[PDB]
Amino acid sequence: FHTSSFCRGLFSSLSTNRSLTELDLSDNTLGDPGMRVLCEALQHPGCNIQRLWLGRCGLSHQCCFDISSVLSSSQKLVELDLSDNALGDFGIRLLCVGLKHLLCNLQKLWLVSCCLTSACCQDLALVLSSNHSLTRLYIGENALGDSGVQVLCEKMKDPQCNLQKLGLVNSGLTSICCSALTSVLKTNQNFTHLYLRSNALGDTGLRLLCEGLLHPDCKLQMLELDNCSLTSHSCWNLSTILTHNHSLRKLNLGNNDLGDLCVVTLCEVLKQQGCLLQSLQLGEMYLNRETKRALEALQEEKPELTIVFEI
Amino acid sequence: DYCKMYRRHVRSRFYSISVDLNSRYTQLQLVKESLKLELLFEPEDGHSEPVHTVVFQGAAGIGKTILARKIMLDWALGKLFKDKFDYLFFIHCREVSLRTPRSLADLIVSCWPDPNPPVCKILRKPSRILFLMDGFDELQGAFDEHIGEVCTDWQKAVRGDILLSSLIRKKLLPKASLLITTRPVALEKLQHLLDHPRHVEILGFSEAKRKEYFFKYFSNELQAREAFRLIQENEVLFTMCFIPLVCWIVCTGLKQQMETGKSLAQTSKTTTAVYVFFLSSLLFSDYLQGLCSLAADGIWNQKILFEECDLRKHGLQKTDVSAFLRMNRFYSFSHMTFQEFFAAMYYLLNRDVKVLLENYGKFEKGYLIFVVRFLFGLVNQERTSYLEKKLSCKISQQVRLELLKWIEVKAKAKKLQWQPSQLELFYCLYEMQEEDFVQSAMDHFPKIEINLSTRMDHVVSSFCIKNCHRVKTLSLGFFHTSSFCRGLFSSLSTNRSLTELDLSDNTLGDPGMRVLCEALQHPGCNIQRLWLGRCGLSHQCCFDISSVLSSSQKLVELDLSDNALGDFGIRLLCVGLKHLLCNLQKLWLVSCCLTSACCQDLALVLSSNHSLTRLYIGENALGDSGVQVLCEKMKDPQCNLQKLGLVNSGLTSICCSALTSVLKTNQNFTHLYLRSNALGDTGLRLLCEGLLHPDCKLQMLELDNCSLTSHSCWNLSTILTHNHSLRKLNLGNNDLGDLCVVTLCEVLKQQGCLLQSLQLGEMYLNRETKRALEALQEEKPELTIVFEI
Ligand SMILES: CC(C)(O)c1coc(S(=O)(=O)NC(=O)Nc2c3c(cc4c2CCC4)C=CC3)c1
Ligand SMILES: Nc1ncnc2c1ncn2[C@@H]1O[C@H](COP(=O)(O)OP(=O)(O)O)[C@@H](O)[C@H]1O
């Protein structure tokens, strides 16, 4: 709170510390040379850090070279955060060299709001077939777009891909990439969670998602759709998804004008014992009194199916 | 009102080009050397010299005539030049014969519908009057001798060329407006006659504009869509369709094909021979000979408005008028390119081909090359056979050998200014499409320089370079490119002869540089030299270049001057440089926006790479810290660096001790540059400290503009008296004083000094100083001096 000399003097001892496991440095404007000095500190064999969060650190593409060296040299790191640093597509291109290294043990990788574009996506694709320890990815709040999402997914469809909890919050997508996502759901057997909020998917996009959701080989255990700007036309598709998907166990429909008929049809679909859904949200809309009675009833006979219908 | 009826008359004249103009019209792309058509005459800057001088350039069939007629019709329809101008006039070179002297009154009367215009009323406000000169390629027939003939009377009857030349320089109606449309070939002299013009080039259709044109041509939407699809079936034809004339020809050909039942894919399959295939699909030897001779005599005589006498001479009769020709009696070709095509076809059915070879240049902007282009089109063995078997005629074959000899004449000549550009030669060699003779007549280009500005340029360059097999030096110009770079540089990796590749000043960008990097690292390429000055690169390209260096062992030198690589970019490069397989020898890094921080990394290179001989890191904010860091690690005698340079590095005497250590230790550090550094006399003394060392090897020491003085002057004397190895020097912009110069003289007098050059440029010495310098030059002539300012 106001540092190359500062960073050296502090982090020299941290490499010799054999007990440290988590290192938080969020919101510190330690700058890029400080991040470099931290990188020379970490890659010492003594340090036992398994966790490094660097949100809003003010880094840039320059630190990515050093971080790639750290990843290629250190086998104890588990997750890593880089949210809200202007890494850019070049920064991602630099990171992927370290990520693709056979000794990279990364599992959780945040890249939220890293000022990326679709161009970096191709490189990221290679990671999924070079690194198998990468379980969950978070590349939301970037101008990826349909081209980038398609590039990532087309290479992601391999069942050997180990990715689980991808997220594309506020990626500016539409229904075009939904076919690729459908292919991913049809093929992958480990892609459990998936986020899509603030994307203009539309009812056509939801139908395209349903195309792969109904697949008997599906494994999706959640599908966020908040603020997707949906409508009541693909509502039969929602009914079909609930009636046939025995694996999906959560959902989100916030800021989606579905209409009273849709809510009551959701209710009557949920009534039967053939649905294993265990959570659902309808936050922030204006429903009807009959709708409220139906929701209260369904909560009454089955208490497991939690709803956040109240705004 | 007079303007209203005049506008109605010119609307009636320019309604059609027959076929309606506006309905078939499609927008074009133009850029000032995009500039909107409504934004022509207002000055972008408030201090523009008279805006009335704008010149237009474009290819054959680009639409200069169509643009002129479209702007005239807009002025006739109430669209443009209503609140700005009031009168627009049309003048044509073909109609205005140069042999008959005329006046502006004649042109106005011809343009006015009424043969009795109010000449007194319409010659008072030239600001609202714009004169259009289209097809300027028929005016400079005597400008090379009529430079000093000037006419300023609007009613005076003087030769058309002289009067128009008077109009151009803004002296006859100087405040009136002018709009000239020209071929870009021969503007070199015309710019002398121009008083602050604006040169605007016309580029033609884009993809959407092409689709719009096919929609506006065919009356059937489905047929237009099928034509569009088959155009995209052939990439070459789709690229060629950026010229509206080619679009018109292909649309007419497709119409003829589908009306007669012929398939449309055959047109797409036909490449580079649109005119010949179109003529064959449209359709006798006497007719062909007569039309060809008419075109040839029009070529010689610069005549387009043929009369009956020409047809009588050529044997052409009244029943010999076809679609290509036009009756108005007046005979005129519909479009000139057809006339040059017929003239080219003439010489294969004066018949001496040498007139095309040597009499080029007698006509401005060179109609002949275009002619000769179709010649390379027709002499193609398959195309020659097709012509013979489709017209039952015979084609001469010695013409091909004569064209070969002309190719070597063009390639090996000295006075290359008058000849057209080499890109025209590449257009010809792509037009012909005969592999073996392309290779044979193309092995005569060891060095290739081309400037590319369109898809046609890229395609012909790719084909030509792929055909090349013995080229050493190659340069490129991207004068306005990831797809462009891929299409070109894919072949360069397969080229086993290239050794030098110049790309300076091209704004190829960073992704283009990346694509170039994937092109180079292929094992096939034999490039030993890559210059990239002012390429506009950045730190991103450094990763790719480092990969290239670590993967390629044929590269020798490399230039990166004036790119904002930065210290991070240097950090990225050093990884490739430190690689054991890097064979770099010469590395320029001038003005790379570096700082001292990168210097440390550079130091490692000198002890990781031993092939790096000479370095040039001048014009950077390195400073004393960076220079000391570099030198302290450079002092090892095993370091192989020779010709380091630190021009304008902002140094002072602090780093001079480190430089002294380098000179004392290193045995290969021959040259060294220090200009524009505030070293001072203390710095020069510190340099002398190591200069006097018996182990020194410094063979030059530049000191220009170092801001020296006369206090360390004894040190200069000592350096000359003791250094037996130093053989050059520079002291420009250094106030040393007369005593210093004369002491330098007397020191140099003795035979113990082996200095072989010295400079004292740009100072104010004495008469005695000049006599001493002249004397020392007299007794020993080897010691050259540039003392004279
Ligand atoms: C060097 C430079 C800039 O390309 C140039 C210099 O001079 C000229 S031009 O004025 O001769 N115009 C043309 O050749 N147009 C033209 C072209 C193609 C095909 C045709 C034509 C005319 C009919 C068929 C293909 C590319 C250009 C152009
Ligand atoms: N703006 C345009 N819209 C539609 N067609 C055009 C346009 N410009 C040129 N053309 C085509 O080009 C032909 C005329 O070319 P022209 O303007 O005489 O070339 P240049 O101006 O180089 O002499 C016509 O047949 C027409 O089909």
Curated annotation (Swiss-Prot), chain B:
Its EC number is 3.6.4.-. The modification Phosphotyrosine is found at Y2, Y6, Y15, Y25, Y616. ATP binds at T26, G58, A59, A60, G61, I62, G63, K64, T65, I66, H335. GO terms for biological process: acute inflammatory response; cellular response to lipopolysaccharide; cellular response to peptidoglycan; defense response to Gram-positive bacterium; defense response to virus; detection of biotic stimulus; inflammatory response; innate immune response. Keywords: Activator, ATP-binding, Cytoplasm, Cytoskeleton, Disulfide bond, Endoplasmic reticulum, Golgi apparatus, Hydrolase, Immunity, Inflammasome, Inflammatory response, Innate immunity, Isopeptide bond, Leucine-rich repeat, Lipoprotein, Membrane, Mitochondrion, Nucleotide-binding, Nucleus, Palmitate, Phosphoprotein, Repeat, Secreted, Transcription, Transcription regulation, Ubl conjugation. A lipid is attached at C592, C593, C599, C713 (S-palmitoyl cysteine). This is NACHT, LRR and PYD domains-containing protein 3.
